[PDB]
Amino acid sequence: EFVPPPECPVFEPSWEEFTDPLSFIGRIRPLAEKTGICKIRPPKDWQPPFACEVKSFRFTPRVQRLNELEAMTQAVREYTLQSFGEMADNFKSDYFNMPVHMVPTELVEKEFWRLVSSIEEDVIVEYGADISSKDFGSGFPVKDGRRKILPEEEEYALSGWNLNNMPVLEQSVLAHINKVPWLYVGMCFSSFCWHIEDHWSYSINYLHWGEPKTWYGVPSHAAEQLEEVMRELAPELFESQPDLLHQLVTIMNPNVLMEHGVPVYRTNQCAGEFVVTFPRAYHSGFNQGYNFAEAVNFCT
Ligand SMILES: O=C(Cc1ccc(Cl)cc1)Nc1cnccc1C(=O)O
Ligand SMILES: [Mn+2]
Numbered sequence: 001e002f003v004p005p006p007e008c009p010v011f012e013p014s015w016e017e018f019t020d021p022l023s024f025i026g027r028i029r030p031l032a033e034k035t036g037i038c039k040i041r042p043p044k045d046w047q048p049p050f051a052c053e054v055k056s057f058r059f060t061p062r063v064q065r066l067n068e069l070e071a072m073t074q075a076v077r078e079y080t081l082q083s084f085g086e087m088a089d090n091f092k093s094d095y096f097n098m099p100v101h102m103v104p105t106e107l108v109e110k111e112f113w114r115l116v117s118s119i120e121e122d123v124i125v126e127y128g129a130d131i132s133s134k135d136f137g138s139g140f141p142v143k144d145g146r147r148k149i150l151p152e153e154e155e156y157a158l159s160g161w162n163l164n165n166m167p168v169l170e171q172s173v174l175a176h177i178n179k180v181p182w183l184y185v186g187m188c189f190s191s192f193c194w195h196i197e198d199h200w201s202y203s204i205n206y207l208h209w210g211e212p213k214t215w216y217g218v219p220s221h222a223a224e225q226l227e228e229v230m231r232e233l234a235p236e237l238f239e240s241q242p243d244l245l246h247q248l249v250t251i252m253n254p255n256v257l258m259e260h261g262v263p264v265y266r267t268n269q270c271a272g273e274f275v276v277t278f279p280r281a282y283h284s285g286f287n288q289g290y291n292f293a294e295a296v297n298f299c300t
Contacts, residue, residue, distance in 0.1 A: 002113045004106065005254050008217055008265035010039040018043055021160045022167070022300055025202075025276060035265045036281030037217025040274040047272070048156040050208055050292075051147060052183075053136040057081045061128040064190060066115045069251055072235055074124060081185065081292075084128060088187030088290040091125070095188065100211070100289050105268050108288050109214055112189055113253050127287075128185030129192070138164050138181055139208040139294045161274070163206060166298040170199065181296040186213065186287030194230070194284040195247040196223070197277070201297040205275040210291025212268040213275075216254050220280040222262050229260045251284070 009031055017024055024040075025032075032038035060076040061084065079087065092100045096107070115123045133139075141149045141157040142164050149157055156162060168179040188211075197203055207213055218226050230250060231239060238246055254264045268288070269275045277283050 002110045002253070003255055003258075004109065005216060005258065005264040005266040008035045008037045008039060008215075008267045010041060010267070012041045013043070015043050018046070018161070021204075026300070029278070032276065033278045033281075034219050034221075035217060035263075036219040037215055037265060037267065037275060037277050037283055039267045039269055040276065042161065042272065042274070046161075048140055048159075048162070048208075049150075049153050050139055051137060051141040051153075052081075052139050053147070054081055057136045059084075059128045059131055059185065061126040061185065064125050064127055066112070066123045066125070066189060066191075067118055067121075069235065069249060070117050070119055071122075072237070077126075079128075084126075084185060084187070085290045087126075092188040092289055100188075103288075105212060105214065105288055108188060109286075112191070112286050113255075115189065116251060116253065123189065125187055125189045127187070127190035128183075129190075131183040131185065133164070133181045133183060133294065138162075139183065139206075139292065140164055161206075163204060163294050163296045166204060166296055167300075168296065168298055170299050179297070181294045184293040184295065186210070186289070186291045186293065188289050189286055191251075191286035192284055193247065194218075194226070194250040194252055194282050196280050196282055197297050199297075200280040201299060202279055203277045203295055203297045205269070205277070205293060205295040207269050207271050207273055208292045208294060209271050211287065211289025212270045213285055213287050213291060213293060215267050215269060215275055215283060215285040217265050217267075217277065218257070218282040219263060219265075220278060223280050223282060225260075225262050226257060226282050229257055229262060
């Protein structure tokens with residue numbers, strides 16, 4: 001069965017270290033760049049409110065067939081946050097015959113990877129992925145006037161760890177001659193396959209609420225090693241595809257990469273925790289259950 005990769009670094013900055021995100025990320029870089037991904041737990045008393053327009057939040061999530069690649073050899077339906085959560089919890093509790101909170105993270109992980117390569121069982125899930133923060137607002141409070149902000153929430157609207165306040169403009173000559181966070185509503189086994197960011201950007205990811213998001217990361221020094229294993233083992237029909245298209249179907253069990261000598265690290269990102277991905281650090285992951293994440297690419 002699946003062997004969990006080693007854990008990536010977790011940082012628990014003090015209030016002093018927590019003052020500036022770019023400064024803190026710059027300081028942890030000698031360790032974190034060697035693991036590709038890292039997790040950051042804010043101080044216990046840092047608790048932003050959840051600020052999306054819940055009454056009107058509606059979406060049609062994409063359908064994900066876990067074993068679609070293995071198989072080489074359902075209409076979109078609309079939910080609210082509440083109705084998606086009812087569906088997601090019923091799915092997971094039915095699947096494991098247990099209350100959702102009682103399912104060990106290790107068992108979801110082992111079952112996910114078994115299903116990805118199974119030919120006898122076809123499991124299909126749904127992912128509310130790539131929902132713009134413009135549609136119903138960010139999960140963080142923002143001082144744009146669309147939604148009321150209480151006085152005790154203003155510090156979160158102004159915080160450098162609010163994803164809407166991260167720097168996003170890349171330096172370039174074209175910038176002289178001449179982006180908002182995205183949201184992800186997860187359910188058990190919804191997933192994202194191996195990729196890096198456009199422009200080799202950093203990314204930062206915050207889990208507002210719900211069950212954990214499980215991540216795998218590869219440090220940038222091993223990016224070419226990973227791409228070589230993909231070439232060798234990915235289906236030939238997709239082998240000639242440009243990376244921007246191949247990344248839509250680059251699903252690969254971390255143990256396969258590990259057997260080929262690619263360093264892989266894992267983490268369970270829990271509610272209230274951040275994950276940072278370093279430049280050119282391949283990453284992939286899946287959701288343990290019903291949850292809500294926000295992510296943005298930022299530059300240093
Ligand atoms: O990219 C996606 C969404 C997605 C896009 C296309 C397909 Cl085919 C599947 C999934 N998500 C992520 C990308 N990076 C970090 C984290 C995530 C996340 O889901 O938490
Ligand atoms: Mn990404």
